[PDB]
Write a protein that binds this ligand. Sequence first.
Ligand SMILES: [Zn+2]
Ligand SMILES: [Zn+2]
Length: 92
Amino acid sequence: MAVSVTPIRDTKWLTLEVCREFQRGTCSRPDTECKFAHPSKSCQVENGRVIACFDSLKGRCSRENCKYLHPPPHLKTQLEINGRNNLIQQKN
RNA sequence: GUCUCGCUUUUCCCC
Ligand SMILES: [Zn+2]
Ligand SMILES: [Zn+2]
């Protein structure tokens, strides 16, 4: 009676950014050490972003060949902080 | 366009 919600699921809290230099063929670090993500031809990459695997983000993937991005522990933590900010509802 | 995407939340609300 005093709240509202988006018609569709908000993917913005599950997406991670693709490296600017990886998209140019100029980056020189593995996905594990770079500041951003290095997806494959099989990932659902769009507009320099990819939706990350929820099960992997929680520390235990539940598939064997999933279409989402698997980020390193530091980026998993940044993604969970972005998710938690909605549970905390800091904006309201 | 599976792109409204296979998981969309760590519990009201967010979603
Ligand atoms: Zn890079
Ligand atoms: Zn996975």
